[model samples]
Target: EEKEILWNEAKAFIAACYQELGKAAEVKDRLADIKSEIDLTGSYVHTKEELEHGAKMAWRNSNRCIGRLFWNSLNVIDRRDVRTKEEVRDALFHHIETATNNGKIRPTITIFPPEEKGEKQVEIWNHQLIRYAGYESDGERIGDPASCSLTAACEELGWRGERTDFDLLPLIFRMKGDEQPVWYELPRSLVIEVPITHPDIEAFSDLELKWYGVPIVSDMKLEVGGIHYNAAPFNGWYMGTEIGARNLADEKRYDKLKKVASVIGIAADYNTDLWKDQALVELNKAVLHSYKKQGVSIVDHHTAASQFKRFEEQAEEAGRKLTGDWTWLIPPISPAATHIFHRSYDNSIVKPNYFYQDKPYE
Candidate 1:
């Protein structure tokens, strides 16, 4: 019984993975060999088909993601062969370019090397491959404060930035825990950016804010059938409120609400006048307006929530129980407006799911 634990997880995944794909006939065919491989080498390799479908399963099981509606359509890339740090960076660079798709974003993921012999093999240090740099000189914070610590780490590594509000950080990565992590600058050509501007506010462009077309989350470990793919970076088109309501509006991040409020002459009115509320709403509007105007794929909060409700219906119709992190499923702004806020989910972690990894620099 003690020796059967690993196969229990493996068998369950083999069954789950193939069952959904209408390929139960191949389940025993694959699992029989997988068990032998695991018994011999302490782990089994995923077939390209298993890798791709498992990645999609992980996305679907991700409680924290609101964009799970597109889980089945993910572009699953098999980069498990690119083990070298330099080549991994190239794979990631390719990730940005292809997924960016000239602003027509695709829900994409690249699965990297998994653990070997119970040891972590490869990992990307940055939380997201594309993000603005943060720097604080004196009392004034010059960039996105959310990026401050990472910016400091980049500086310590001798990477320099112009200290602008939107300077992009380099990709930091490593091979195995014993070696030093290295950073590489991403090609400026591959990174597509959208300049944020409000639809009606002519002066909004003066804010000069912009965000990257894709957010390639590189830090999470993709676990499939008990195997951990340590460097699986993924991206989906943004929900407007993610950028507008939280990332840019949160006081800890960009703190742009005050500035946007001031432009509309509501800066001093404070919460009593619901001025801050208006600023936040307008910021969200700006993000949706700008991304659409720029021909970039994005969804407004209401539409995204409606789609999630559709996801809920489909999941129930498929006879699957749901698990979701309600905090994340609800739109950051105007939570009550979305059906997600009123609903509760099991919020349990499922295997073949994404799990957070420790920071390489840490």
Candidate 2:
């Protein structure tokens, strides 16, 4: 039975094409230009290839008896003679055809007839029919309320405490326990504040934008568990080739990259004056201070000690490096920005995990 239905559907589709052979050719010619533009822009478009692949899958997965069900429901409303299967099919087809023709003016396809005044109420006769599934009227997914606070917000939203100079950022939603936020549903919803010092951004301004570059703000989103979750900040760390091109278009790279780099150097130098050794000493003190004020439990001291060692290494590496060229290891390009671009093409894009050395405290 399924095979017969499929063959009939194929025959109908072929007949429809034969009826519009000239228009079909015109569509083909126009779509070639569209495809080329998509390739160049890296934008998504719904083309014939996508439609053909998608529609067949949709039809196969759908219940084919929907027409009969709709007609029977209608019969209960008017008490008119029951519709034969053939009559139901013809009625459904012509109605769809009329709707398709009308949709150029106003786009909507109707699967149910208009209810006569109180006709629907009389038909059901107190039988309650569920219209939509998997929801109560007022229920909504939300993020943690404490996420709005400064100290716990990032952690609650799954942000990494340890970060590189370049990290693509996710929007800080409600903390871990709150209802998941709806904004995560948008494409690339995670966010990061791209500091001006990024190398790719700077190069892009000098080369691509042909103007002074400024800091960029960017974000990304990921689908998880039949929904999307707010993830880490996007620092464009993993952006490979194509993202390199986009960064080249950054206008703020020229304006801010050098300034931000200089600022970091100055900050590091100032910390040396205050702590007499490395900036990591001051940074750890600041973190502890912030935690104390927030009443948050301090991270394990042994872990903190190891983190301090790692920070010492990074600071030493930066110090050993020449001055005035103080740049992220990857240069002006940030890890967050690159990761977002990479994931845009392929969601399975892997991010780098920073490893620390063994700690004396641990």
Candidate 3:
């Protein structure tokens, strides 16, 4: 039954690709080979074209990704032959350099070896290729609260970086057949980070907040025609509010709203929405302004929302349904200000998509 499903999905996808590219005759023999492989092994290898299209389809099916309008533009790095930790580490660094593009951020994905033939699957433990450190001491937490477990894992492996608020976590990975995992500290020089500052609020610079140029998510499993690529890390450029509104401004995160409110002289009253709302607006503005000043690619909520609406129309024109998780598609800051907030969507999970796998550490 599973094999049947795999075959059907592969046939539909391959047919679409061939029809769109007008190359069905050229890939006729290759398609036959793929079908044979699926019949015998329950999965088939994706040709270069298939892999590229599959990656884009995965993004289109990514309900949480608001930047799917540019799905067809994703640079898919075919590294399916990579099997060693060292090779994977090098590929990741290359991904960072290329994706960062010195602030002209590019949407990209690195496909690793797929699960097959009793062989070990490659798995990356970190949520994103670059994230901050977190330390707990006497009921106080320093750095990013989200990275506590990953930080502990790095420490357990004898990694002792500065342990600062914005320390990049080491790349941790292991093959399914291996009992021990390997870790590599990403080179500081390879990462491009922006020091956030506001255009009007001068004191915002003193906050010393920063975020990595790329948002490469390394843990999600990329499933294509029943073949699971466990180490497929992909990234898109940021939407400003992703960092300013949630990562830095949320109470469970950096919780900088109160500080921002005080800095901007919005008063210390907790009862009124004026202070919090005012501070949030400033925070988002700073993120957008800072990224633009540094030549980094980032979208404001309004632009991102507009792009998504266009994406919906394009998908419909292409005879495809745009599936999305409304909760995530809406920006955290000024949710109602965007057109996405006014519509309903089908939040169904689909094939050839990126899916969250089991936590690598826990």
Per lDDT, the best of the predicted structures is 1
Lowest lDDT sum, 10 consecutive residues, model 1, at 1-10
Expressed as tens digits, the lDDT of each residue in 1-362 for candidate 1 is 32376678789899999998899999887988987887787778888998899999999999988888888999988988885777888898988988999988988998888887557777677989999889887898888887888888888888999988989999987788546678998789988899998888889988888998887898888888878788889999988888998888888988888899877666555568888889988888999999999999999988988888988998999998888999788887889988898879889988889987677564
The superposed Cα distance between candidate 1 and the true structure at residue 250, in angstroms, equals 0.8
Q: For residues 177-262, could you state the per-residue lDDT of candidate 3 as single tens digits?
A: 78878889889899989999999989888888898888889988887766677788999999999899999998888889989887
**Global lDDT of each model?**
0.86, 0.24, 0.85
Write one digit per residue (lDDT tens) for candidate 2, span 1-362: 23343333333333333333444544444444544643464322333432232222222212211111111111111112222333323332332233223211111111222112212101110000100011112453112111123223334445442222122223222222234321111112211112122222332222111111111111122111111111111110111211221222223211222323332353424443542222222223333333334332333233333433353355356452211111221112232332222222111211111111221111
Using lDDT as the measure, name the better of candidate 2 and candidate 3. 3
**Candidate 2: stretches off by over 4 Å:** 1-154, 168-178, 181-362
Task: Judge candidate 2 against the unseen true structure and give its global Cα lDDT, from 0 to 1.
Answer: 0.24
Query: Candidate 1 at residue 242, lDDT?
Result: 83
Cα shift from native, residue 41, model 3 (Å): 3.8
**Pairs clashing within candidate 1:** none
Worst 10 residues of 2 by lDDT: 124-133
Best by TM-score: 1
lDDT of 1 at 321: 84
Q: RMSD per prediction, one decimal?
A: 1.7, 26.1, 1.8
